[PDB]
Each structure stands twice: as structure tokens, then as C-alpha cells.
Design a binder for these strands. Structure first.
Lengths: 218, 88, 129
RNA sequence: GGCGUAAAGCGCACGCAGGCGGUUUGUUAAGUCAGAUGUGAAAUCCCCGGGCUCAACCUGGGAACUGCAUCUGAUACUGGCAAGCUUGAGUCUCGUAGAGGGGGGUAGAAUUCCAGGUGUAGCGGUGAAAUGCGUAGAGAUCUGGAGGAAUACCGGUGGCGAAGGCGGCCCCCUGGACGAAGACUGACGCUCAGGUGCGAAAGCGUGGGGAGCAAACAGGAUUAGAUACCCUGGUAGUCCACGCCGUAAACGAUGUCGACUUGGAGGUUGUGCCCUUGAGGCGUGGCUUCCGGAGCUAACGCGUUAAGUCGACCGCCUGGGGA
């Protein structure tokens, strides 16, 4: 992407030792990921994501931290990709036989809020007895229409959204992630170079990920 | 614990062209000079198994370096053990 | 301490291949560069290079093609304390003929093929697939 | 096949005789590999022709029995022998820390003992109590003094030592390890039966020693009983001159030796470099603690200080109850 920018100085320190093949360290008081093991792969990574989108693969976007959620939802709300932008539910892709009933409970509690003791003229406190609904919608609201299993995961940070990576590696699904020296090199299928001081400037990369999952003419 | 000033009376006589101090003929002399010094040392005193094992270490290395010199040249071996006390 | 230059030769390769490394390096010797020359000829390695004014060290490059390791067995067989010697029809068929063996012989390091073609036997040095 | 525990790794140091050992050349041919001629008795397996249907059996022809000897090639590796090396191993210039050892010392406190004062019925002790100490003036508080042992604090995230173990300050004697910048030898290495030398507590010997703690013992009890717990007294033993003893949950229950290889946090000791113009910053050897990853393991753990990856040598071992 050629931008990238200037920083002085970070990561002295702060590394996952499973990165030794990909890192330069133990010298010059730096720990830094080798530009020859990020950029020559990142210029040739989105072709492999268009390869999933072009066969109607179901795409998932994840970013639940407030400085990233603002851009992640803006890149999925009127797109083919599905999203999670506030919070994860336990086993939301792995425990599928239960999550499919949790998606059904979005109807059950919505219709409960219109029945019997809840079909009243006053609801002020009464609808706090059905607040399980918005607690479940907080996780399912952008993915309730996806069904079964996805075909690709994109995640805005390889470490701050780790539950989505744990679900995806159990379910066998390719993970595309933005990396950091403290993240894990084993949970990710395609790495993207970037810095957390640039989490509002990488909107162009998310732009290219979103453009890649709509190129075609398939 | 043997000074550069005490070695100056060993490497002078057991040498030949200088520096020779790495050679078996000079190291067997430098071990003998430490063995014979750490022999007494003892009497007065006895009850120190650490320096006793140090003495037996220096003897262990000398026994081997003598056997090794004899296994390279018998004449250079016999012409050393007339200048250092061995076999009475 | 160290008795056999071959007892730390193939471990590096078996463990480096498990670490997914593209090159493996060792202290050089006559037999190490004789084995490497045949492993290159039979295509088990890509290339090898040797250099050092203080201590000569030998680096060889591993084959993975597009990701999967190309050498599917790396074994020694025979050791100086208990050597294995095979005769002109007792020469082995490694991995039931999917792999090969290397022998030292009176004519110098060669394959079990080259030995059986030469109508001779000798001492085992390596087993590969 | 197996040695962390389930069952076996020696408590430890050094090392002869054994096993094992880098590398450049030649040469020997013990050993290997290749080729022959002899031999490997006959029955007999297995192939296969007869004889009784099948076959046991009688056989007619083959094969194998990798062997062994005697002749003869290959000339690579191992042993051997010489010649040649080093970047395996070693010692060192200037230097570094340490409760290591030995010999010397050297200092303080209370229960105690010794001679008394001041002084009155208390003291001591347990979950409860009681023997017992005390009116001979206790307990406690003072004056002047004797006796024996150990070394408060800092002390830990720490060191050292072969282990066992070892903290004071001060003066000698001394092993080993370790850093900086170089050099002289030239495989001189790794291991090790039986040896050759070590000891914590307790015990044995000869002579001293005796505050505190205390087996044994005598009481108080307590109790159904108490021979014990718990309380009051108390010798052996603890200390020293030494001389013996040689054993341990001697324990991170992991034999010694070498290489290769994710870390983090932290301690401890040298040291390369930037006017250290240096508090700072950038490095780098030695030793080592906790957390833990690939691998290993039945499991817990081991985890670059590996129970991992692989090699040399040694020591052991095949169920309890009996023993």
C-alpha cells in the first residue's frame, strides 16, 4: 500500500517467540517484523480472498473496539459481508446447533414481548423481564442472516478479537488479519502489516478488502 | 597460585628458543613446580580436602603429560625426568 | 565428548526440516561433502555451499517445492561401534524401493544402485526417501 | 525391553586395566566387499522323474547348507605404524566474586553458678491442675565476679563447596571457577570394574566439659489404665583435644560427557564502546531463580541448565506376602 509512515521508537521488547522466522530482533534495541515477509505477501493476498467471494463464499468482518467498529460497520451494513461490531456470544459459530436456536430466540423473546403479561398499555418496567433479547441481539444483530458456516474471516486486529480467530480455527475457516509483534502467527492464514497508531488511517485497507469482496463479474 | 616471577625461573631453564611454554617439556615442569609447592603447604596442617584434590588434579595432569611425552619421544622424556624428581 | 562427525549431521536436517527451515548448516568434513554431492545428484537437496577460514562450515538447501517437504525419510543406519555391511545382493531397497541407500565402498561414496551396478557391496552410511 | 516415581542411576572426587576418539598423506592387510578352485558324507526339507490311489517309505536327478581353507582383485573405512596439522583439549600476561576449606584468633547476651544488700508472700505452670520453687527470705531488683555454647541485625531476588555442608569482624595459608586483548603446544581428549580419599545426625575410644535443650529416669498427673501426650525436675548426648564409624527423604528421588535449538521476568559477576566529558545509552562472556512453548512422558513433571534431539562409556534390573 506504500503508506505506511514514520515512527520512532517502538517494540524493544514486546514479541511472541513463535515469530522468530518472521522477525528481526536481538539487535539494535528493536523487535520488528521483516518487510520481506509482509509486503511481498500482502500485495498478493487479496486475490486469494476474491477467489472465495467469486464462488459465493460467506464473508465475516470483525472489529468490536470503538475506534475500529466505526469503520467496520460502515464497510458491512449495506454489503454482502456479515459483521460483529459490539460483542461475541460463546460458541457463536462452533456451537452451531445451539446458536441456531439463539437466532430463533430473537423471534421468541420479540413475540413474548407482545403476549399476555407483556401485551399491556404500560411496559416501562415489564419489558425489562425480556431484556435477554437485546443482550442476544448485541452479538447476533449483523450475522443472524448468515446461517451454518462462513467461508472467510476478516479481522481488524490479530490479537484484540482473538475469540473470532479461535472460532474460525475450530471451524476450519481462512483468517485474514492485521498483525502485531505480540499476536499469534499460527491462528492467521493471511497477514496484513499495520500499526495501532494508524487504526483511523487504515480505512483505505478496509476499503480494498471491501472492494476485493465485490470485484466481479464472477 | 604461582607468580610470573617464579615461572621466570622455570621457563628460562626448561625452554630452548622462546616462546616454548605451551610445549609438554615446559608444562610438565610448570605442573611439577605447582605440585612440589602444594605438597608443602601440608605439614603443618592436613585437614583440607579441597587443596588435596587440587594437588591430585595437578598430579593427574602431570602423569598424563609424562605418558604423552613418552609416547612422542622417549629421549625427550628421559632427558626431562633427570631434571624433575621421578622414580627416585 | 564428540566421537563421530556423522552423529550431529542428520539430526540438524531432521529437526530443521521440522522447524520448516530452507537451509541447514554444519561443520564441514570429507564425508559430509561426499554425502552432499550424491544427495544433490539424486535431487534430495537443491544445492550446497562451504566456506570458512577459521572453521569451514557447510550449508545445504532443503526442498519444499510449493510447501510440502520433498524428503519423506531421513535416516542414518550403521554406526562406528556397530557397523552394517551389505553384500552385492543383500544391498537394501529402502522404503520398499520408494527410497535409496548410500554406501562408502572401496571406490568411494555412492548409491546402492551404483554399488549393485558395480557388482559390489560395502558399508552403509545413509538411508533416505 | 527398562532405570524421575510405578522396578533398576552408585551420596561424592580422581583414575589404572578395559570401551570410545578430529584430520592431511603413505603403507600393513587383522576386518569388510569382489572372483575362483577345493570342501561342506549319505538319508532329508524344496524343485522334480519313477514306484503304491494321496501319502508314510524306497528313491532317480537337482538345489541349498550365506560356512571354512587356499589362490587373487578393489584400495574405501576401522585397527596398526610413521610423517603433517589445528580453529578438539590445555596454560597464561592484566584482572573478578564468593556463608568453600585449614590455621589463628576475636566480641557480646540471658536462663546458671558465687557472696551479699533492698524486701514481703508470693513464685512456677496448663486446655484444665498439681508435684515443685519459697519465710533457711523466694520471685524480682542491684553490686562485684565465675562458667558454657553459638556467632542476632544485613540475609534476599542471593553465593561458595566434590558431595555432606558453609554466614560475624580481623590476620595469614590455599583449591576451583570466570572476563578482557593476545599466544605457545599439537588429539595431549570422553568414560571407568576393582581401587584411592571424603561424612550429616546418632554411636564407639582416651582425657576434659556442662549455662540452654533433653532421650533414659523419678514425680505431678490425667485416666478405665498411663508404663505416653501435657506439666516439674534430669543423666546420656550436644562442645573440645583428637582417633574411629562410613551411613541419610545424602532429594529438583533425574549417572558422567558433547553438540543443536522459541522465549519472558529477574538476580548475581566480569567486561567491549560513545570527549563514557555519563548520571545515561549501545553491547557481551560466566553463574543461576521463577513462569512456560515445540518435543518427551501413563500422568504429574522435564522443558535450551530439557525427562527434548542424538552419540561414547559406566553402574543396574525383571511382581508383592516371605526377605
Amino acid at each position: 500500500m506504500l503508506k505506511a509512515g514514520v515512527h520512532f521508537g517502538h517494540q524493544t521488547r514486546y514479541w511472541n517467540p513463535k515469530m522468530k522466522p518472521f522477525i528481526f530482533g536481538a539487535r539494535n534495541k528493536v523487535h520488528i517484523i521483516n518487510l520481506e515477509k509482509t509486503v511481498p505477501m500482502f500485495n498478493e493476498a487479496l486475490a486469494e480472498l476474491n477467489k472465495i467471494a467469486s464462488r459465493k463464499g460467506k464473508i465475516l468482518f470483525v472489529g468490536t473496539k470503538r475506534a475500529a467498529s466505526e469503520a467496520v460497520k460502515d464497510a458491512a451494513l449495506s454489503c454482502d459481508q456479515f459483521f460483529v461490531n459490539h460483542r461475541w456470544l460463546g460458541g457463536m459459530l462452533t456451537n452451531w446447533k445451539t446458536v441456531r436456536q439463539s437466532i430463533k430466540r430473537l423471534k421468541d423473546l420479540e413475540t413474548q414481548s407482545q403476549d399476555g403479561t407483556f401485551d399491556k398499555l404500560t411496559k416501562k418496567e415489564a419489558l425489562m423481564r425480556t431484556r435477554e433479547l437485546e443482550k442476544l441481539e448485541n452479538s447476533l444483530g449483523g450475522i443472524k442472516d448468515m446461517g451454518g458456516l462462513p467461508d472467510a474471516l476478516f479481522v481488524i486486529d490479530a490479537d484484540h478479537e482473538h475469540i473470532a480467530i479461535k472460532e474460525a480455527n475450530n471451524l476450519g475457516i481462512p483468517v485474514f488479519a492485521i498483525v502485531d509483534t505480540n499476536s499469534d502467527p499460527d491462528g492467521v492464514d493471511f497477514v496484513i502489516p499495520g500499526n495501532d497508531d494508524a487504526i483511523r488511517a487504515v480505512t483505505l485497507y478496509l476499503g480494498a478488502v471491501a472492494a476485493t469482496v465485490r470485484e466481479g463479474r464472477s | 597460585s604461582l607468580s610470573t616471577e617464579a615461572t621466570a625461573k622455570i621457563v628460562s631453564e626448561f625452554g630452548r628458543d622462546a616462546n616454548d611454554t605451551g610445549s609438554t617439556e615446559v608444562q610438565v615442569a610448570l605442573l611439577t613446580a605447582q605440585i612440589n609447592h602444594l605438597q608443602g603447604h601440608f605439614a603443618e596442617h592436613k585437614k583440607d580436602h579441597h587443596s588435596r584434590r587440587g594437588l591430585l588434579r595437578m598430579v593427574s595432569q602431570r602423569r598424563k603429560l609424562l605418558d604423552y611425552l613418552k609416547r612422542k619421544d622417549v629421549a625427550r622424556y628421559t632427558q626431562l625426568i633427570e631434571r624433575l624428581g621421578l622414580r627416585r | 565428548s564428540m566421537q563421530d562427525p556423522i552423529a550431529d549431521m542428520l539430526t540438524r536436517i531432521r529437526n530443521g526440516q521440522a522447524a520448516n527451515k530452507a537451509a541447514v548448516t554444519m561443520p564441514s568434513s570429507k564425508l559430509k561433502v561426499a554425502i552432499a554431492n550424491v544427495l544433490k545428484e539424486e535431487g534430495f537437496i537443491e544445492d550446497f555451499k562451504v566456506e570458512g577460514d577459521t572453521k569451514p562450515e557447510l550449508e545445504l538447501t532443503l526442498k519444499y517445492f510449493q510447501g510440502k517437504a520433498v524428503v519423506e525419510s531421513i535416516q542414518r543406519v550403521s554406526r562406528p561401534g556397530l557397523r552394517i555391511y551389505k553384500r552385492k545382493d543383500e544391498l537394501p531397497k529402502v522404503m520398499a524401493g520408494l527410497g535409496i541407500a548410500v554406501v562408502s565402498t572401496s571406490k568411494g561414496v555412492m548409491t546402492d544402485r551404483a554399488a549393485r551396478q558395480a557388482g559390489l557391496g560395502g558399508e552403509i552410511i545413509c538411508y533416505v526417501a
